[PDB]
């Protein structure tokens, strides 16, 4: 299922380990393979935040009603209104010189208290989001399974798991494959201290805290049920005083100004009180021990196979081609053979280890990694068996060194989780993991067909050369020998 995305990486899990280290970008996928187990596909399906608390409520569209101005010309004391009691009422005291055209006893500063009722609609609500209660859901798909559907993806193969920094570990009950035990740390990246979700009428955004507070409007930190609306005056204005009345007007809605201001800000998808991040990455270590093969007990197929699509290069050094199974022996593992031009049958590592067909007329997906140069990949047995000839361009050692670079990068990214130093045994296991990751290509390619004992003796000879009387710097060969030896128990 991960042919679709680029950036997929094949992390060959070392045999006899309970750690597999991965990183799952929001747009990513990893296909890990171990010797004794089928092939995984893991991709961070979708991060999400939820259970976020209310913060503030900025008014946008103000409405003034029941404006009431009361006056009293000098000598009678300052004007007073009843309406100053209600916080829902704005009130304002100004002085205006009562002219003789108004005609009370004296001339002088005529104080004016003016009051009116405040109404807000189309309010904007700001809500906090915390580093906690963020859950990313991880999807695993396991190859080899054979789906009766046109798309060769057995729905019963895939399982999900939601993981939080509060509940860091989760196990996926891959039916009949064995529970996959995954534990992980979700570095969000986009800090939850500085960002605040901005609830508009129908849209949401991820806006800066300082920007959100520096916005100037009438807000209300009270409950959403009823809002106090402090700092009302910023969105209403007082008419120039007249001896009789002081008219109060507001500016009207600010939908456009707010929309324009927030437009050049990250747009945040909203779904059932769940907002999808895109920054966060997962630093997961995959405990795969409790997983086992399936179908290993069957026989090998002997009926005919039919092709559905021609082998299309995936660009990732792999070949994918959905082959159908018309036959009778219902449960059966598909044999599979990658043959070099010469007699070499160790041509290339197979990704979809142990493909098996669980019904009649299934559409199994296969994915293989042919060797460099010429190749011929069989798909069955008998005269009728299909054959597909392939030619993989590119140098061998070149792909080896590109793999070394990729391993260096992935190691660095996983750096803290890549290394465990609680115990010397665990630290040794981690160091071996790093060595194997950084030297997998170099080993599996630059050391091929040499022979198992021969490689062991090569490491021993290099160790002796390092221990021999020579330059202290040249002892690097002795150190490299140990890495070779460690890569023999692999």
């Amino acid at each position: 299922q991960c042919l679709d995305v680029q950036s997929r990486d094949f992390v060959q899990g070392v045999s006899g380990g309970t750690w597999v280290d991965v990183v799952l970008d929001h747009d990513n996928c990893i296909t890990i393979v171990a010797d004794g187990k089928p092939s995984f596909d893991i991709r961070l399906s979708k991060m999400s935040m939820s259970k976020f608390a209310e913060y503030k409520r900025y008014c946008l569209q103000a409405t003034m009603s029941d404006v009431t101005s009361i006056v009293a010309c000098p000598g009678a004391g300052d004007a007073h209104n009843d309406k100053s009691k209600n916080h829902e009422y704005i009130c304002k005291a100004v002085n205006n010189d009562r002219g003789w055209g108004n005609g009370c006893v004296l001339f002088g500063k005529g104080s004016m208290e003016t009051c009116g009722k405040f109404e807000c609609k189309k309010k904007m609500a700001g809500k906090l989001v915390a580093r906690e209660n963020v859950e990313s859901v991880v999807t695993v798909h396991v190859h080899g399974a054979s789906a009766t559907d046109t798309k060769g993806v057995d729905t019963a193969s895939t399982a999900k798991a939601t993981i939080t920094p509060k509940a860091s570990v989760a196990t996926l009950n891959l039916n009949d494959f064995g529970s996959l035990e995954v534990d992980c740390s979700t570095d969000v990246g986009m800090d939850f201290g500085e960002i605040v979700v901005a609830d508009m009428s129908g849209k949401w955004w991820i806006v800066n805290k300082d920007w959100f507070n520096e916005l100037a409007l009438p807000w209300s930190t009270a409950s959403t049920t009823a809002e106090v609306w402090q700092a009302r005056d910023r969105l209403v204005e007082f008419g120039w005083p007249h001896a009789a009345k002081q008219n109060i007007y507001d500016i009207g809605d600010q939908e456009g100004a707010v929309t324009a201001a927030i437009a050049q800000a990250p747009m945040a998808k909203w779904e059932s009180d769940k907002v999808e991040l895109i920054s966060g990455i997962l630093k997961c270590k995959v405990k795969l021990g409790n997983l086992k093969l399936r179908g290993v007990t069957y026989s090998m197929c002997a009926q005919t196979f039919t092709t559905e699509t021609r082998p299309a290069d995936t660009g990732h050094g792999t070949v994918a081609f959905k082959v159908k199974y018309v036959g009778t022996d219902v449960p059966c593992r598909v044999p599979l053979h990658i043959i070099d031009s010469d007699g070499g049958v160790a041509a290339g590592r197979v990704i979809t280890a142990h493909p098996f067909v669980m019904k009649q007329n299934d559409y199994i997906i296969l994915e293989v990694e042919p060797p460099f140069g010429d190749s011929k990949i069989e798909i069955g047995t008998g005269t009728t068996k299909l054959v597909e000839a392939w030619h993989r361009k590119g140098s061998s050692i070149g792909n080896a060194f590109t793999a070394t670079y990729k391993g260096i990068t992935k190691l660095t990214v996983l750096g803290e989780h890549a290394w465990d130093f609680n115990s010397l045994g665990g630290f040794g296991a981690s160091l071996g993991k790093a060595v194997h990751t950084l030297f997998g290509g170099v080993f599996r390619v630059m050391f091929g067909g040499m022979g198992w004992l021969t490689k062991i003796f090569v490491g021993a000879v290099l160790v002796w050369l390092g221990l021999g009387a020579h330059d202290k710097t040249i002892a690097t060969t002795m150190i490299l020998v140990g890495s070779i030896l460690m890569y023999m128990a692999v």
Binding site: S65, D66, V67, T68, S69, I70, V71, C73, R98, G99, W100, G101, N102, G103, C104, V207, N208, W211, E214, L215, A216, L217, R234, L235, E237, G239, H242, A243, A244, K245, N247, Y249, D250, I251, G252, Q254, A257, V258, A260, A261, I262, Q264, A265
Partner: protein, 140 residues
């Protein structure tokens, strides 16, 4: 309707221009007079002596003030906003590599030419000098 030593009448669009005898006749000339509603305005009407002219008073009233409560629901739709401001608000904006660190050290050397020359002179008596320059840029 008089309440709390304050006299009010539910004046309407019909009431413009004609006096209403209430100890003294009283009339209004509010351009926003109309239908009484939620969007209403209520204020004083100062009783002005005849020895004067109505000045800036939407209602000019005789010998007894009387409060008015004309609603601005004229022509059904709401009265004009008389908007007089532009609230405009700050746009949000869209939001160590050795290249930027080289920028920092270059801005240090151009920032402190004399100390940089001192360090260069000291280190020569080569690569150690460059390392010292990087370290000094870090230190300051």
């Amino acid at each position: 309707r008089t309440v709390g030593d304050l006299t009010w009448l539910n004046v309407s669009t019909t009431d413009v221009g004609k006096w209403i005898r209430v100890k003294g006749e009283c009339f209004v000339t509010a351009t926003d007079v109309g239908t009484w509603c939620s969007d209403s305005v209520g204020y004083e009407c100062p009783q002005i002596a005849p020895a004067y002219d109505p000045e800036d008073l939407d209602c000019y009233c005789r010998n007894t003030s009387t409060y008015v409560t004309y609603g601005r629901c004229k022509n059904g739709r709401s009265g004009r906003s008389r908007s007089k401001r532009a609230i405009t608000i700050a746009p949000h904006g869209e939001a160590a590599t050795p290249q930027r660190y080289l920028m920092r050290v270059e801005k240090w050397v151009l920032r402190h030419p004399l100390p940089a020359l001192v360090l260069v002179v000291l280190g020569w008596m080569h690569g150690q000098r460059a390392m010292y320059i990087v370290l000094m840029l870090l230190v300051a």
